[PDB]
C-alpha cells in the first residue's frame, strides 16, 4: 500500500511505503485520534522474532542479506537465546541500533544529524561509580568546549527487570527546583520532586535559582547513588540581549548540553533502560518552553514589564512581543559564546530536506507534527505546512516510568 | 473505553466518554496516525434519522415520550414513501447548532448555542440564493458588531439537483496570474477567479477585488452576482506605532463566512449552508498575510522595520510577524469590527472544553487546528491534550463543484 503526504505551501506530494514495516500500536483507532496525547522480563517466544527482524534489517543495511555471515549470526543468536534466555549485540549492531532509534524518533526535528552519533559502549559497567565516570566522559566529549557533538552512552541491558541500570535524572544537566513554604518556587518548577529526592538522599542544596542537580545513579537494580558532575565540565551561557542592556540583569543563564537520560532504548527486543543521549539545543526549547511556560521559569511578565509593553490587554500582543525578544537573546547569547545552537527556522528547513530525502531513499519518515512544529511562530516555519505520518519503527526510544515509582528499595 | 485527557500546565485531568457515541472514521489506524493530514438509500437513512431524533428528544427531556415515538413513526413513514424526509424547524436549528458544537477544528465553539439560523429551504433559484445571502451578510455584519449566522438552502435529493455556493467563503479576494510570472491579489483564488472570468465577470484586476458569488440552484448551472459593495465591511490595516504601515495598502474584510462545506443532520445533506462568525486575528495576520502561498508580506514588512535580514537567527521573520498581527488587531478594534485575539480565544476554548466535559462527557478537538499558528505554547491549548473524533450532526468538506458539475 501507498500513503501520500502533501505540503500545502509547495504542493510537493510524497509517497510513504515505510509505514508497512511498522508493527507497534499508535494509540489511535479508526474512531479516535490520540495524536495530541503525550503518553498514548520478556519471554523466549517474543524475543527471537524481534532479534531476527532486527538482524534482517542490519544485514540488509550492510548489503549482506542472506549471506553466510547473516545466517551464522541468526543461528548464533537463536542458540544464545535458548541457552541463556537473552543475547548480546555485537558492537557494530549496537551502533547501528542506536543510530536507527534516533532516525526513527518521530518527535525529533533534529534527525538530519542521525548518522553522526558517537556511541559509547558502557555495557561492561557494573557500579554506580562506574556509571558516573562514563557520564562525565560523555559530557566532556559531547560538550567539546562549545562545539557540541552528538553522543549516546549505553549501559547494560535489562535482564530480569530486577537488576536495571537507570539514570534517575530526566536529563544529565538540569537545575534544582525548591517549593517554598509560601507556595512560590525557587529555580525550575519542573524539577521539584526530583530535587526533594536528591535532598532526601543527602544532597546539600545551595538553594539558588540555577543549582545544577547531582546525578542519581542506579546500577544493577541497586539503590541509586548521588554524584556531583565536576562543575568545570558543565558549560553554561549567561543570557543577554543584543539591544537591551537590562536583559543581563534578569540573571538568566542556561546550560549548553541537552542530554535526555530517562528513555529506554529498544534494539532487537533488548531493553537498554539507561542510555543517556545528547545533541544541541534548538533555541525555542530554552527561550519558549524553559523560560516562558507558566509552569517553568515563567519570565514573560518581568520581561514585558522591562520592555514597557502595554500589558492591560492581551490584544496588544505583549506576550508575543516579549517572547520574540527572549528568544533573540538566547540565540545571541549562545552564538556569542560559541556554543552550538540552532534557530527554529534553520532546524525546520533542514528537517524538511531530511524528510524528503528519507521518503526518496527509505520510503518514509515517521514524524509527529504536534512535536515537530516549534512552540512559537508555527506557520512561518515550513513544517507547519507539511503533512506527516506518525508510526512506530524499531529500534526506538521509549518513555519509561520514573524509577522512584517502581524501585524496590533495598536499604 | 473511558479516556483521560490531561492538561500539562495545570495537571487537570478530564474523562472523555462522549467519544463512544462517535460513528464516522478518523483516517487513523492502530498502525498509523493521520492527525496532520488536511483531508483524510432508504436503508441507510432511517438509522441516521433515528440516531438524530433520539438525541434531539433527549435534549428536550422527552426521550421515550409519545411525541418522540410519534415523530420516529412519522419520519419512518415519510422515508418509506418519499425516500427522504423533512426536518421540523426546531430540529433544523438544533442540528445546525450541534454541527458547530461538533466541529473539532473550531476554537470558537464557546459560542455554539448563539447561532442565528436562517431557514432557506424554500429557495428555488440562484437569484433567491443571492437575496438570502445578502440578508445573511447584512445580518451577521451588523455594522461591525458581528453576529454568528448560518443560512440553510434545500437538502440534497437525488444528487443531480444540488444547491452549491461555488465560492469557498462569501467574501474573498480575486487572484490573477501576471505576465511578470507573479501573482496579483490572493494566490489562493486564482482558479476560482478564472472560472468567474470565463463565466462572464469583468475583473478590475486589482490586489483586493471582492469576488462575485457563483450560485448554483437545483443542480442548475451556477450564475454570477456581485454582493452589494455597501454590504461588504472592509478594514484598512494600520499600526499603532509604525506610520509607514498604512502605505503597504493592506486591507481585510470583517466577515469570515465559510460557504463550501456540507451540513449533515439526521442523514440529510445540506450542500449549501454558508455560515459566519468573526475572525481570530491570526487567521488574517499570520495566515492570510504571511503564508508564502498567500499575500506573503513578511519580507516587505521586515524591510520597512529595517531588521537584519542576513541571518534567520536574528528572528526577523518572527519580529515582523508579531507587528503585522498587532496591526490587524488594532485596525479592527479602532474601526469597531468584532475580532478576537488568540490569547482570549484559546482561553475561552479551554473554559468551553471544561464545560463540555462536565456537561456532555467530552469535546472533540483537533489540536493541530486548535493551537494558533503563532506563539503556540504561550496559549493554554498547546498544553491541553485533546481527543479528536467525529460526531453528527457535522460540517464536512466536499469536492469543489467545478469538478463535479456537468454544464
Ligand atoms: C543534534 C541536535 C538535535 C536537535 C536540534 C534535536 C531537536 C529536538 C527537539 C527540539 C526535540 C523536542 C524537545 C522537546 O520539546 O522537549 C527533540 C526530541 C527528541 N529527540 Fe532530538 N534533537 C537532536 C539530537 C537528538 C539525539 C542525538 C537523539 C538521540 C540519539 C535525539 C532523539 C530525540 C528523542 C527520542 C526525542 C523525543 C523526546 C521525548 O519524547 O521526550 N535527538 N529533538
Ligand atoms: C464566532 C466566532 C468564531 C470563531 C472565533 C471561530 C474560530 C475558528 C478558527 C480560528 C478556525 C480555523 C480556521 C482556519 O484556520 O482556516 C475555525 C474553523 C472552523 N469553524 Fe469556527 N469560529 C467561529 C464561528 C464558527 C461558526 C459560527 C461555525 C459554524 C456555524 C464554525 C465552524 C467551523 C468549522 C466547521 C471549522 C473548520 C473549517 C474547515 O475545516 O475549513 N465556526 N473556527
Ligand atoms: C511525560 C513525557 C513523555 C515523553 N515522551 N517525554 C517527556 C519529556 C519532557 C516533556 N516536557 C519536558 C521534557 O522534555 C525534555 C527535553 C527534551 C530535550 C530533547 C533534545 C535532545 C537533544 C537535543 C535537543 N533537544 C515527558
Ligand atoms: C482542503 C480543506 C479541507 C478543510 N477541512 N477545510 C479547508 C478550508 C481551507 C483550509 N485552509 C484555508 C481554508 O480555510 C478557510 C478559512 C476558514 C475560516 C474559518 C472561520 C470561520 C468562522 C470564524 C473564523 N474563521 C480546506
Ligand atoms: C498536550 C500536548 O501534546 C503537549 O503540550 C505537547 C505539544 N507539543 C510538544 N512539542 C514538543 N516539541 N515538546 C513538547 O513537550 C510538546 N508538548
Ligand atoms: C499540514 C497541516 O495539517 C496544515 O498546514 C494545517 C495545520 N494546522 C492548521 N490549523 C488551522 N487552524 N488552519 C489550518 O489551515 C491549518 N493547516
Ligand atoms: Zn491519530
**In this structure, what CATH number is given to the domain that contains residue A268?**
3.90.340.10
First vs last Cα of chain B: how many Å apart? 49
Q: Tell me whether residue A192 is exposed, middle or buried, using C-beta atoms within 10 angstroms of its C-beta: 0 to 12, 13 to 18, 19 or more.
A: middle
* Angstrom resolution of this structure: 2.0
Residue B270 CA to residue A223 CA, distance in Å, equals: 66
**Could you say which of A102, A108, A318, A325 is catalytic?**
A108
Task: Clarify whether residues B83 and B111 are in a common domain.
Answer: yes
- The CATH number of whichever domain residue B321 belongs to comes to 3.90.1230.10
The answer as to whether B243 is a domain residue is: yes
Can the peptide bond before residue A401 be classed as cis, meaning omega within 30 degrees of 0? no
Task: Clarify whether residues B131 and B229 are in a common domain.
Answer: yes
Three-class HEC string of chain A = CCEEEEECCCCCEEEECHHHHCCCCCCCCCCCECCCCCCCCCCHHHHHHHHHHHHHHHHHHCCCCCCHHHHHHHHHHHHHHHHHCCCCCCHHHHHHHHHHHHHCCCCCCCHHHCCCCEEEECCCCCCHHHHHHHHHHHHHHHHHHHCCCCEEEECCCCCCCCCCCEECCCECCCECEEECCCCCEEECHHHHHHHHHHHHCCCCCCCCCCCECCEEEECCCCCCEEECCCHHHCCEEECCCCCCCCHHHHCCEEECCCEECCCEEEECCEEECCCCEECCEEHHHHHHHHHHCCCCCCCHHHHHHHCCCCCCCHHHCHHHHHHHHHHHHHHHHHHHCCCCEECHHHHHHHHHHHHHHHHHHHCCCCCCHHHHCCCCCHHHCHHHHECCCECCCCCEEECCCCHHHCCCCCC
Q: Is B227 in the pocket of ligand 2 (CB under 6 A)?
A: no
CA A65 to chain centre: 32
Q: Is B343 within 8 Å of A314 when comparing Cβ atoms?
A: yes
Task: Clarify whether residues A132 and A119 are in a common domain.
Answer: no
> With the CA atoms of A381, A387, A393 and A399 taken in that order, what torsion angle do they form, in degrees rounded to the nearest 10?
60
Residue B166 CA to residue B214 CA, distance in Å, equals: 5
A361 flagged as catalytic = no
The answer as to whether A37 is a domain residue is: yes
B273 flagged as catalytic = no
Asked if B246 reaches chain A (Cβ–Cβ under 8 Å), the answer is: no
Q: Which residues form the domain of B336? A: 234-256+279-344
- The CATH number of whichever domain residue A178 belongs to comes to 3.90.440.10
Task: Clarify whether residues A360 and A335 are in a common domain.
Answer: no
The answer as to whether B23 is a domain residue is: yes
**Could you say which of A158, A280, A325, A365 is catalytic?**
A280
- Named by the residue before each, gaps in chain B exceeding 2.5 A from C to N are 40
Task: Clarify whether residues B48 and B177 are in a common domain.
Answer: no
> Locate cell 465553539: which residue?
B109
Which ligand number lies closest to the CA of residue B29?
Answer: 7
Q: Check if the beta carbon of residue B165 is closer than 8 Å to that of residue B259.
A: yes
Q: Is A36 in the pocket of ligand 5 (CB under 6 A)?
A: yes
Taking CB atoms within 8 Å and a gap of at least 24, the contacts of B304-309 are B304/B242, B304/B244, B304/B245, B304/B248, B305/B242
The answer as to whether A386 is a domain residue is: no
Q: How far is the CA of B278 from the centre of ligand 7 (A)?
A: 29
B183-185/B213-216 β-pairing: unpaired
Q: How close is the nearest chain B Cα to the Cα of A254, in Å?
A: 18
Residues 6+ apart with CB under 8 A from B334: B238
The answer as to whether A228 is a domain residue is: yes
Asked if A77 reaches chain B (Cβ–Cβ under 8 Å), the answer is: no
Q: Check if the beta carbon of residue A347 is closer than 8 Å to that of residue A282.
A: yes
Experimental method: X-ray
The answer as to whether A9 is a domain residue is: no
A398 flagged as catalytic = no
Residue B50 CA to residue B56 CA, distance in Å, equals: 10
Task: Clarify whether residues B251 and B224 are in a common domain.
Answer: no
Residues 6+ apart with CB under 8 A from B87: B95, B265, B266, B268
Residue B200 CA to residue A401 CA, distance in Å, equals: 66
Number of domains in chain B: 3
Three-class HEC string of chain B = CCEEEEECCCCCEEEECHHHHCCCCCCCCCCCECCCCCCCCHHHHHHHHHHHHHHHHHHCCCCCCHHHHHHHHHHHHHHHHHCCCCCCHHHHHHHHHHHHHCCCCCCCHHHCCCCEEEECCCCCCHHHHHHHHHHHHHHHHHHHCCCCEEEECCCCCCCCCCCEECCCECCCECEEECCCCCEEECHHHHHHHHHHHHHCCCCCCCCCCECCEEEECCCCCCEEECCCHHHCCEEECCCCCCCCHHHHCCEEECCCEECCCEEEECCEEECCCCEECCEEHHHHHHHHHHCCCCCCCHHHHHHHCCCCCCCHHHCHHHHHHHHHHHHHHHHHHHCCCCEECHHHHHHHHHHHHHHHHHHHCCCCCCHHHHCCCCCHHHCHHHHECCCECCCCCEEECCCCHHHHCCC
The answer as to whether B219 is a domain residue is: yes
Q: How far is the CA of B191 from the centre of ligand 4 (A)?
A: 17
Q: Is A26 within 8 Å of B36 when comparing Cβ atoms?
A: no
Q: Is B35 within 8 Å of A369 when comparing Cβ atoms?
A: yes
A270-272/B394-396 β-pairing: unpaired
Beta-bridge partner residues of A166: A218
Q: Which of A32, A297, A345 is the best mutation test for B, with the most CBs of B within 10 A?
A: A32
Task: Clarify whether residues B321 and B244 are in a common domain.
Answer: yes
Q: Is B277 in the pocket of ligand 2 (CB under 6 A)?
A: yes
Q: Check if the beta carbon of residue A164 is closer than 8 Å to that of residue A218.
A: yes
The answer as to whether B95 is a domain residue is: yes
Task: Clarify whether residues A144 and A230 are in a common domain.
Answer: yes
Q: If you take atom 10 of ligand 5, which residue's CA is the nearest one?
A: A371
Q: Check if the beta carbon of residue B238 is closer than 8 Å to that of residue B331.
A: yes
Task: Clarify whether residues A218 and A367 are in a common domain.
Answer: no
Residue A260 CA to residue A241 CA, distance in Å, equals: 28
Residue A126 CA to residue A132 CA, distance in Å, equals: 11
Task: Clarify whether residues A60 and A96 are in a common domain.
Answer: yes
First vs last Cα of chain A: how many Å apart? 55
Residue B241 CA to residue A61 CA, distance in Å, equals: 59
Beta-bridge partner residues of B216: B164
Residues of chain B in contact with residue A23, where contact means CB-CB under 8 angstroms, are 31
Q: Is B100 in the pocket of ligand 2 (CB under 6 A)?
A: yes
B109 flagged as catalytic = yes
Task: Clarify whether residues B268 and B229 are in a common domain.
Answer: no
Q: Is A108 in the pocket of ligand 1 (CB under 6 A)?
A: yes
Atom of ligand 5 nearest to the CA of B384: 1
Tell me which chain A residue has its CA closest to the CA of residue B296: A380
Sign of the dihedral defined by the CA atoms of residues B257, B260, B265, B268, in that order = positive
Tell me which chain B residue has its CA closest to the CA of residue A330: B313
Task: Clarify whether residues B174 and B41 are in a common domain.
Answer: no
Instruction: Give the HSE-up count for residue A48: Cα atoms under 13 Å, Cβ half-sphere.
Output: 15
Asked if B375 reaches chain A (Cβ–Cβ under 8 Å), the answer is: yes
CA B306 to chain centre: 37
Q: Is B293 in the pocket of ligand 4 (CB under 6 A)?
A: no
| CA-based nearest residue to A364, from A28, A9, A7, A106 | A106
Q: How far is the CA of B257 from the centre of ligand 4 (A)?
A: 9
If contacts are CB pairs under 8 Å, which of residues 249-288 in chain A contact chain B?
Answer: 283, 288
Residues 6+ apart with CB under 8 A from A261: A167, A169, A170, A171, A172, A274, A276
Amino acid at each position: 500500500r501507498f500513503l501520500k503526504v502533501k505540503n500545502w505551501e509547495t504542493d510537493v506530494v510524497l509517497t510513504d511505503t515505510l509505514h508497512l514495516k511498522s508493527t507497534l500500536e499508535t494509540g489511535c483507532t479508526e474512531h479516535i485520534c490520540m495524536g495530541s496525547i503525550v503518553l498514548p522480563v520478556r519471554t523466549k517466544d517474543q524475543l527471537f522474532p524481534l532479534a531476527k527482524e532486527f538482524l534482517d534489517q542490519y544485514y540488509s543495511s550492510i548489503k549482506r542479506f542472506g549471506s553466510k555471515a547473516h545466517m551464522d549470526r541468526l543461528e548464533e543468536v537463536n542458540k544464545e537465546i535458548e541457552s541463556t534466555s537473552t543475547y548480546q549485540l555485537k558492537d557494530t549492531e549496537l551502533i547501528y541500533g542506536a543510530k536507527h532509534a534516533w532516525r526513527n524518533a518521530s518527535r525529533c526535528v533534529g534527525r538530519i544529524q542521525w548518522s553522526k552519533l558517537q556511541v559509547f559502549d558502557a555495557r561492561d559497567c557494573t557500579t554506580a561509580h562506574g556509571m558516573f565516570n562514563y557520564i562525565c566522559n560523555h559530557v566532556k566529549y559531547a560538550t567539546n568546549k562549545g562545539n557540541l557533538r552528538s553522543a549516546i552512552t549505553i549501559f547494560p541491558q535489562r535482564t530480569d527487570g530486577k537488576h536495571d541500570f537507570r539514570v534517575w535524572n530526566s536529563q544529565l544537566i538540569r537545575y534544582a527546583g525548591y517549593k517554598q513554604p509560601d507556595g512560590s518556587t525557587l529555580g525550575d518548577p519542573a524539577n521539584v520532586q526530583f530535587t526533594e529526592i536528591c535532598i532526601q538522599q543527602g544532597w546539600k542544596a545551595p538553594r539558588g535559582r540555577f543549582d545544577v542537580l547531582p546525578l542519581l545513579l542506579q546500577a544493577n537494580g541497586n539503590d541509586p547513588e548521588l554524584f556531583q558532575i565536576p562543575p568545570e565540565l558543565v558549560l553554561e551561557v549567561p543570557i543577554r540581549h543584543p539591544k537591551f542592556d537590562w536583559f543581563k540583569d534578569l540573571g538568566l543563564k542556561w546550560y549548553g548540553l541537552p542530554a535526555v537520560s530517562n528513555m529506554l532504548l529498544e534494539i532487537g527486543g533488548l531493553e537498554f533502560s539507561a542510555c543517556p543521549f545528547s545533541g544541541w539545543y534548538m533555541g525555542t526549547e530554552i527561550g519558549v518552553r524553559n523560560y516562558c511556560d507558566n509552569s517553568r521559569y515563567n519570565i514573560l511578565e518581568e520581561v514585558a514589564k522591562k520592555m514597557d509593553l502595554d500589558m492591560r490587554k492581551t490584544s496588544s500582543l505583549w506576550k508575543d512581543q516579549a517572547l520574540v525578544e527572549i528568544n533573540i537573546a538566547v540565540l545571541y547569547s549562545f552564538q556569542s559564546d560559541k556554543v552550538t545552537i540552532v534557530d527554529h527556522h534553520s532546524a525546520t528547513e533542514s528537517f524538511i530536506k531530511h524528510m524528503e530525502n528519507e521518503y526518496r531513499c527509505r520510503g518514509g519518515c515517521p514524524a509527529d507534527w504536534v512535536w515537530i512544529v516549534p512552540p512559537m511562530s508555527g506557520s512561518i516555519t515550513p513544517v507547519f505546512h507539511q503533512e506527516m505520518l506518525n508510526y512506530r519503527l524499531t529500534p526506538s526510544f521509549e518513555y519509561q516510568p520514573d524509577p522512584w515509582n517502581t524501585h524496590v528499595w533495598k536499604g
